[PDB]
Amino acid sequence: FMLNSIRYVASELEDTLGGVYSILSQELQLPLVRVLLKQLQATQQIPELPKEAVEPTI
Amino acid sequence: YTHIYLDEDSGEYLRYEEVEGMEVQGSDGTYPKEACPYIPIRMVRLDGESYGRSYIEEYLGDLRSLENLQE
Amino acid sequence: KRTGLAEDGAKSVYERLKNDRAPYETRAQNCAQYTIPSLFPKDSDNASTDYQTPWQAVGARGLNNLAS
Amino acid sequence: RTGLAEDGAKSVYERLKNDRAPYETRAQNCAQYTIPSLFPKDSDNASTDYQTPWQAVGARGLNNLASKLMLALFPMQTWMRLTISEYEAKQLLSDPDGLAKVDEGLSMVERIIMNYIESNSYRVTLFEALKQLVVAGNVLLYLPEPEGSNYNPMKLYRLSSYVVQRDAFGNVLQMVTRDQIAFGALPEDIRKAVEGQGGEKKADETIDVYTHIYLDEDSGEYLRYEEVEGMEVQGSDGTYPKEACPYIPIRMVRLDGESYGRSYIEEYLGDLRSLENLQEAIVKMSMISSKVIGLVNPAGITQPRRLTKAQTGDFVTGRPEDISFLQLEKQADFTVAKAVSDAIEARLSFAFMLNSIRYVASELEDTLGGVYSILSQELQLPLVRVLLKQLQATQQIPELPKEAVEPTISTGLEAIGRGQDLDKLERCVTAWAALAPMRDDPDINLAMIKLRIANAIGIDTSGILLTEEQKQQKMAQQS
C-alpha cells in the first residue's frame, strides 16, 4: 500500500509498487481532458481554430 | 433514470432520461462515441468482465488474516 | 419508439443489469468492511447504523495513503 | 484462400488451440502463485473470487519486473536511433552540413515517433503486455493503420485470444486472433457480413471474429483476411510484407522448436511453491494459536462458574494452578520454517531485482535476467519498424533521402540516449578549449594535435574541424 515508501511518487514509488497507475491515466485523465475539451470548446472559453491538426492530448 | 446506448445502426450514443415509465421529451441529447461525458471507470480491467477488480480485492486475504489475528 | 437496447425501457434494463452487478457490490462491501466500512455501505444500511471499526486498522491507512 | 487457409480461420484456430493448452496451463499456475487476477481461466468469469497468494512475493516481483522493464525498454528519453551508415551518404553529399541536416531530420523523425507513441497511450498497453510477458511470456500487439488523427491504441491480444504456428527457425508464421465483438458495435463491413450470412443478430449477443494471416504458398508475402462465420468479409483482403507486419507476436524467452512461451517466472515457480507452502503453514499455525481454550484440571477445586459470574476483584475460591490454557508448542519447527522462508524470499528478491537509464538496464535489469536485450528485438524494433512505415504511409514523417535506408537501431543499450555522441563531442570540444594558451608556440601544430585527439576519441570531425583546404578557402574568402 506504499505506506513504507510528482514524477518520483508517480513513474516510480506508485509504479514499481501498485502494478499500473497508467491505466487511471488512460481511463480517468485522458477522457476528462477530452470532455473538458469540446465542452469548453463548444462554449467560448477556449479558442477553437485548429486548422492545422487535431492537437492530440498526451 | 438516464440511459445511453449504441445506435443500432452505424450511429453514435443515444442519450435520454426516463423518470416514470415514459421518457421526457426535453431530454433527447445525442453524443458522439468519443466525447461521452459519462466516462465509466475501471481500476483493473479483465477481459469479459464489464468492470470491477479493485486493488484491495487481491489483498483481501491478507486483511482477513490480519484482522483475525488482531481480534 | 426507441430502437434496440431501449425498447423495453431504462427501468427494465437497469433491473436486468443489476443482477449482473451483484458480485461486484458484494466484493466491494467486503473490502469496505475490512477497510473503512463507512465508505461503501449496503443499500439497506441507513442512519442509526453503527460501523464497527476494523481491528487491523492497516487497511484504512493503506487505502487513505493510496488515494492520497 | 488455400495454402494454410483452405480449411478456414475457425478450423485452424481450433486445431492450434490444442497446442496452446500447455502454455495456458503453465501461465495459469504462474498467475495463481503470483497475482491470480492477471491471467484468469476461460471458465473463470465474474462472481469468482481470486484467493490472494499466501507468499505475496511473486506479485511484488512481477510488479517490480514489469515496472523496471518499462522504465528500461521504453523510457521518457528517445529509445530508438536512426543511423545513416556514414561513408555511404558522404559520397553523394556536398559538405558535412548536409550530413548534419540529415541527422537533424532523423532526430525530427525520432521526435515525431515519440509524439505518436505518447499521443496514442501506447505506454499503458506496452506495460500491460510487459506484465503479461513476465507472467506468461507471449503477447500479440496489433497496430491498426492510422486513420486521420484520432487516437488508435494497439489492441493488445492476450494468450487466450490468439494462436501462432512456428517452424524450427520460426520462419513459418500462421497467426489467428479471436475477438468477441457484440453485434451493433461490429465494424460496418462485418455487421453487414454477419447480417447477410444469417438473418437478424441481437444487439447484445456476441459475435466471434477471426483474423488469420499466413505465408503465401508461393513466393509471396503474408496474406491477411477476417472471417466472421464460415465465409470471410470482402472488405478485409489486405496483404502485408513479411517485414512490416502490424501484428508483431511477442515472446519473452525463446526456445527452438517451441512456437512461444516460457515465461520468466516459470523457472522460479518451484521456489514460489515452496514459499507459498511454508507461508500457508505459518499462517495456519498462527490461526491455531489465536484460539483460546481454558484447560481446567478436574483434580483441582477451581470451578469456572464462579470465575465467569464474578466482576473485577471479587475474591473467589480456587487455585491458579488449576486453570491452564492450551498452547501451540510447535516452536522450533516454526524457527526452521521461518529461516527457510527467509532464504527463499531472499533468492527470489535477488531474482526479481527487489534487492537492487543505464543502471536500471545494463547493470541491474539486464544482469538479473538478460531479457532487456531479447525484448529489444521482439518488442522495441518490430514496433518502430511498423510505426515508422505507417507514419510514412500517412503524411506525418515524410522521408525522401535517397541516400540510405535509415536503419532503426533501437537496441536500447546501444542507443539509450542517442548513443555516446554528446559525451564524445563535449570531451573533444573541451580538449580543443585547452591548448589555447599555447597557440603562440611555433614548435607544435595545433591542428595536428586537435585531429589526433579527435581520432583518439573516434569522433567524426568532417565538418566540425576545417581541413587545410577549408582553412585556405575561408581565409581567401575573408580577404
Side-chain angles (χ1 to χ4, degrees):
Chain A
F1 292 135
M2 291 205 48
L3 291 172
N4 266 357
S5 68
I6 299 159
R7 176 162 272 96
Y8 151 97
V9 298
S11 302
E12 331 177 12
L13 236 70
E14 195 93 18
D15 180 6
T16 57
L17 192 290
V20 37
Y21 112 120
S22 307
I23 200 200
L24 303 179
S25 74
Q26 195 204 16
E27 186 85 354
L28 186 60
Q29 273 178 7
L30 172 58
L32 186 75
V33 181
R34 274 217 315 273
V35 167
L36 281 172
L37 301 166
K38 306 169 193 174
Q39 282 189 9
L40 272 53
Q41 200 171 6
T43 187
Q44 310 317 104
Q45 293 179 356
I46 59 170
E48 41 177 3
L49 72 165
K51 203 198 306 187
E52 293 206 341
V54 185
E55 292 73 20
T57 61
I58 58 163
Chain B
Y1 296 92
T2 314
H3 169 214
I4 71 173
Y5 56 95
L6 288 196
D7 203 355
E8 71 285 0
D9 70 78
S10 299
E12 305 165 354
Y13 283 72
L14 303 179
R15 182 256 194 187
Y16 80 100
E17 291 180 353
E18 164 173 341
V19 62
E20 299 215 320
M22 297 299 293
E23 80 184 23
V24 303
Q25 64 281 50
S27 180
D28 285 341
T30 313
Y31 293 100
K33 178 261 286 181
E34 184 79 55
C36 188
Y38 281 61
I39 307 168
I41 308 296
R42 326 165 291 160
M43 171 155 258
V44 181
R45 63 178 69 133
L46 288 62
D47 291 331
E49 277 157 8
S50 47
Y51 47 83
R53 294 333 189 198
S54 67
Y55 181 73
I56 302 164
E57 190 276 331
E58 69 275 16
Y59 295 81
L60 194 66
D62 282 356
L63 301 173
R64 258 80 173 278
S65 281
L66 181 53
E67 182 165 0
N68 292 334
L69 266 70
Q70 287 287 1
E71 181 187 340
Chain C
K1 180 170 68 177
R2 284 280 162 181
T3 63
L5 300 174
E7 51 266 22
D8 63 358
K11 181 68 180 293
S12 50
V13 302
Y14 178 88
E15 291 315 347
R16 277 196 319 97
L17 282 166
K18 177 163 69 35
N19 299 329
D20 281 352
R21 187 185 60 185
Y24 304 113
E25 298 191 24
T26 51
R27 263 185 272 88
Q29 289 167 349
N30 292 120
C31 275
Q33 183 210 16
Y34 284 80
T35 197
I36 50 177
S38 84
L39 193 155
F40 203 69
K42 322 176 183 284
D43 58 355
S44 72
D45 263 8
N46 67 332
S48 84
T49 197
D50 292 330
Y51 294 99
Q52 214 268 350
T53 195
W55 308 85
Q56 42 84 19
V58 65
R61 194 183 330 142
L63 170 62
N64 290 346
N65 178 41
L66 290 175
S68 174
Chain D
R1 280 277 164 182
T2 85
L4 308 169
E6 47 266 30
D7 57 358
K10 184 177 179 180
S11 52
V12 65
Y13 177 88
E14 279 199 83
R15 277 195 319 96
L16 279 167
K17 175 160 55 144
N18 304 330
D19 291 21
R20 184 184 60 183
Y23 307 107
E24 296 191 25
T25 51
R26 265 193 273 90
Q28 290 165 348
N29 291 120
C30 278
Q32 181 213 18
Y33 279 82
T34 197
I35 52 179
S37 85
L38 181 52
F39 205 65
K41 303 185 282 294
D42 56 355
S43 71
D44 211 22
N45 68 331
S47 84
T48 196
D49 291 331
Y50 297 99
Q51 215 272 352
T52 192
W54 306 78
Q55 44 91 22
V57 162
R60 298 226 304 290
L62 172 63
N63 290 347
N64 176 42
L65 263 170
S67 176
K68 290 276 181 291
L69 274 163
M70 179 49 74
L71 178 57
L73 280 55
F74 298 131
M76 290 293 293
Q77 53 253 34
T78 189
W79 48 273
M80 72 295 278
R81 181 174 202 304
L82 277 290
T83 71
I84 195 66
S85 69
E86 191 271 330
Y87 183 70
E88 185 166 358
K90 197 159 273 283
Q91 284 154 22
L92 54 88
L93 187 153
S94 298
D95 282 331
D97 57 13
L99 183 64
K101 295 331 199 293
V102 173
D103 206 356
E104 168 177 88
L106 296 180
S107 177
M108 181 216 288
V109 168
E110 292 169 26
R111 274 191 267 99
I112 287 179
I113 292 283
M114 281 325 98
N115 188 358
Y116 189 77
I117 293 192
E118 301 186 330
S119 297
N120 295 267
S121 69
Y122 274 23
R123 297 290 299 279
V124 298
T125 300
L126 289 166
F127 182 76
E128 289 187 357
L130 216 50
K131 197 188 300 193
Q132 288 269 4
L133 278 162
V134 176
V135 68
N138 63 7
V139 290
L140 194 164
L141 300 168
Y142 165 83
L143 275 70
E145 176 84 10
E147 202 283 347
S149 176
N150 47 278
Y151 64 91
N152 52 357
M154 65 184 73
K155 178 43 179 173
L156 190 143
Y157 278 114
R158 287 169 42 264
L159 172 54
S160 286
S161 282
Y162 83 110
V163 285
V164 189
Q165 175 151 330
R166 284 189 197 266
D167 54 353
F169 270 41
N171 291 318
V172 167
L173 275 298
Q174 171 154 6
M175 295 146 45
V176 181
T177 68
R178 187 264 293 288
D179 51 354
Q180 274 96 348
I181 295 182
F183 188 82
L186 282 170
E188 299 209 41
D189 61 333
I190 297 162
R191 177 122 51 77
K192 299 310 96 184
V194 66
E195 278 289 328
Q197 283 166 333
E200 169 57 18
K201 317 293 170 168
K202 186 191 303 307
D204 181 333
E205 63 156 356
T206 182
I207 299 299
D208 286 281
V209 160
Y210 297 94
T211 315
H212 168 214
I213 62 170
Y214 59 97
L215 259 66
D216 203 354
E217 72 284 3
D218 70 77
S219 297
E221 304 167 354
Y222 286 72
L223 273 291
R224 183 252 192 184
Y225 78 99
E226 290 190 356
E227 163 174 338
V228 63
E229 279 176 66
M231 213 174 97
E232 80 184 22
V233 302
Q234 75 303 330
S236 177
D237 263 8
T239 181
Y240 295 148
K242 44 192 61 63
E243 191 62 87
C245 190
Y247 281 64
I248 312 175
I250 311 297
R251 327 168 294 158
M252 172 144 277
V253 178
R254 64 191 61 171
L255 294 187
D256 55 356
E258 277 159 8
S259 50
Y260 62 87
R262 308 291 157 191
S263 73
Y264 179 74
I265 62 168
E266 189 216 327
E267 46 252 40
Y268 303 81
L269 192 63
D271 284 356
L272 265 295
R273 262 82 173 277
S274 286
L275 181 51
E276 182 146 340
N277 293 336
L278 264 66
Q279 289 288 2
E280 193 172 78
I282 287 164
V283 171
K284 286 186 181 186
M285 301 205 248
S286 160
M287 292 323 185
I288 285 160
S289 296
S290 73
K291 188 195 183 77
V292 58
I293 305 191
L295 293 198
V296 55
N297 194 347
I301 56 169
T302 306
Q303 282 302 130
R305 72 180 185 274
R306 41 177 46 103
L307 259 58
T308 303
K309 310 175 143 62
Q311 313 280 0
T312 48
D314 189 358
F315 290 98
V316 170
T317 62
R319 319 207 212 94
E321 51 256 24
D322 284 358
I323 298 292
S324 187
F325 293 108
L326 190 74
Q327 318 213 347
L328 190 67
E329 164 177 291
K330 181 173 279 258
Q331 295 288 6
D333 195 359
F334 197 105
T335 64
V336 67
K338 278 293 291 176
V340 170
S341 191
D342 292 358
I344 290 168
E345 275 192 355
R347 59 166 77 167
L348 286 181
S349 295
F350 184 13
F352 294 134
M353 312 172 29
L354 287 166
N355 277 9
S356 66
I357 321 96
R358 285 156 184 175
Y359 287 91
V360 186
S362 173
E363 305 174 356
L364 183 272
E365 208 291 279
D366 205 0
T367 76
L368 283 56
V371 203
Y372 161 105
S373 301
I374 206 184
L375 196 42
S376 55
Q377 144 180 6
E378 290 274 6
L379 187 68
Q380 268 187 326
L381 209 72
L383 184 74
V384 162
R385 286 202 322 283
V386 169
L387 270 176
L388 194 85
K389 289 164 197 290
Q390 292 177 359
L391 282 193
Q392 184 178 2
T394 185
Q395 313 304 0
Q396 296 186 23
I397 62 170
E399 64 173 359
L400 72 165
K402 206 189 301 184
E403 325 184 18
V405 191
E406 296 65 44
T408 64
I409 58 158
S410 54
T411 311
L413 73 165
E414 172 175 30
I416 278 177
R418 272 276 308 173
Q420 283 314 70
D421 304 332
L422 178 54
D423 287 6
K424 284 175 174 287
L425 196 69
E426 65 183 1
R427 184 149 63 261
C428 65
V429 170
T430 47
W432 296 349
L435 304 177
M438 44 192 97
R439 294 161 51 280
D440 57 356
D441 204 19
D443 58 357
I444 62 170
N445 189 359
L446 280 297
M448 188 196 58
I449 295 167
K450 291 155 157 212
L451 182 61
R452 277 164 68 89
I453 61 173
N455 290 318
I457 297 301
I459 190 167
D460 190 317
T461 61
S462 67
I464 298 164
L465 181 62
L466 296 171
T467 193
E468 272 269 12
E469 167 49 36
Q470 289 285 319
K471 184 187 282 289
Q472 203 54 220
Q473 63 84 30
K474 182 175 183 290
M475 292 275 148
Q477 186 182 3
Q478 182 190 9
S479 299

